[PDB]
């Protein structure tokens, strides 16, 4: 009968063993889930540090209004190890000195400059000229390891100039579409209010302009918990919470 | 969006120049390989003799 239970069929030793085992299961499940959370946060901090905080110039991003999936980022930069800046300044000054010094043994005497119409498939730089655009080597004088390293850092300064000029015009585009998106949001609110006043409440989403904020455009939005991603049963459990 | 896509094209335009540089790195790397592999093989031939 329903007044008779599997518990009744049990003997007291089995009852004590089953109860203590399940309560051990309960406490250990609780504590192991708690440490699961704990190492979750610890891993999150490690991820933030090593990826985000190590980067000097951070991974900001553009997404165009008509192309919600196409993304444009400013270029990566790590926080400098002090050799970076020490090199940069000391080398640029002594490299002007190297322009004027005219010392080492030159192999360029054998070769006379000529012209070729296209050479390789075309490449081109953008923005204002770099300093290194004025500060590159010759083609034959580079035949020693240290001069090759100095050429390496000259090309690195080229890297810096291109990344910067690109990213300043990139951020200027950021600011322009920022003021456009602010005014677009205000106009969208105005249009919604006008349409609701007229009685045309069923405004299609194609009339209001696309507010294409990709969450990775401001990547710290992608850090969060999106509780929409929580499982619906876990959401139902979470509803009963008072805070 | 016109500006955005033109900027995307200019990204390629800049990045094409980037390929030159690691090539120079490998140039210096190979010369460094050279200078000591020479002595290694030469002394190998020494003690074979």
């Amino acid at each position: 009968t329903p007044t008779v239970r599997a518990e009744d069929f049990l003997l007291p030793e089995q009852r004590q063993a089953f109860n203590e085992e399940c309560e051990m299961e309960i406490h250990k499940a609780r504590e192991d889930d708690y440490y699961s959370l704990v190492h979750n946060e610890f891993v999150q901090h490690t991820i933030k540090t090593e990826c985000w905080d190590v980067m000097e110039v951070q991974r900001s991003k553009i997404v165009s209004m008509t192309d919600p999936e196409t993304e444009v980022h400013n270029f990566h930069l790590r926080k400098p190890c002090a050799q970076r800046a020490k090199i940069q300044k000391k080398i640029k000054l002594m490299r002007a000195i190297q322009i004027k010094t005219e010392e080492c043994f030159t192999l360029s005497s054998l070769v006379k400059r000529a012209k070729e119409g296209n050479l390789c498939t075309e490449q081109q730089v953008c923005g204002p000229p770099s300093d290194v655009d004025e500060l590159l080597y010759d083609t034959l004088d580079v035949y020693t390891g240290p001069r090759a390293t100095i050429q390496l850092i000259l090309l690195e300064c080229k890297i810096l100039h291109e990344k910067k000029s690109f990213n300043i015009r990139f951020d200027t585009l950021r600011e322009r579409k920022s003021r456009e998106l602010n005014l677009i949001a205000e106009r969208n609110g105005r249009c919604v209010r006008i349409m609701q006043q007229l009685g045309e409440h069923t405004c299609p989403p194609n009339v209001l302009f696309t507010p294409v904020f990709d969450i990775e455009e401001d990547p710290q939005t992608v850090f969060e918990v999106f509780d929409s991603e929580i499982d619906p049963e876990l959401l139902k459990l979470a509803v009963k919470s008072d805070d | 969006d016109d500006e955005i896509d033109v900027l995307r094209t200019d990204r390629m335009l800049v990045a094409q120049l980037v390929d030159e540089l690691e090539l120079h790195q490998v140039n210096a790397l190979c010369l460094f390989l050279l200078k000591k592999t020479i002595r290694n093989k030469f002394l190998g031939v020494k003690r074979e003799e």
Partner: peptide, 13 residues
């Protein structure tokens, strides 16, 4: 080959 190979990576660089 030692001598000429030194010279060849000197010239070809």
């Amino acid at each position: 080959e030692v001598i000429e190979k030194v010279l060849d990576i000197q010239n070809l660089y």
